[PDB]
Design a protein around this ligand. Structure first.
Ligand SMILES: O=C(O)c1ccc2ncsc2c1
Length: 119
């Protein structure tokens, strides 16, 4: 029932993500010199360094907010991909499955802690 535990759990999950080879295209903002039409397709860029920085700055109030930004990394990859069989998109799918598998308990524990607090 620790309402604050999600933060360190998210820091650790981001550490695992940064170790994953599948995260390399998503660690920093998409390079506009390599993908010049990127902002024609994608309205809100997102990357894992921005998520980690937002978390470390104390600018997430809940793990749901962090989860929305991470999910935006994946939806941006799906929207930008020229093919659902592309290398970078395939990396995003694997990384999304890994993230979803790990974030589920973080969200559950946080929501349970909040409910216990307001009981
Ligand atoms: O060139 C591609 O296939 C491709 C697909 C998705 C994606 N997400 C971030 S950069 C990027 C490039």
């Amino acid at each position: 029932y620790d309402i604050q535990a999600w933060k360190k759990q998210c820091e650790e999950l981001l550490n695992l993500i940064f170790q994953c080879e599948d995260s390399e295209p998503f660690r920093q903002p998409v390079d506009l010199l390599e993908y010049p039409d990127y902002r024609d397709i994608i309205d809100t860029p997102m990357d894992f360094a921005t998520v980690r920085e937002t978390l470390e700055a104390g600018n997430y109030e809940s793990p749901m907010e962090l989860c929305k930004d991470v999910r935006l990394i994946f939806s941006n990859s799906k929207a930008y991909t020229p093919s659902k069989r592309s290398r970078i998109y395939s990396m995003s799918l694997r990384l999304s499955a890994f993230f979803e598998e790990h974030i589920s308990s973080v969200l559950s524990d946080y929501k349970s802690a909040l409910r216990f607090h307001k009981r």
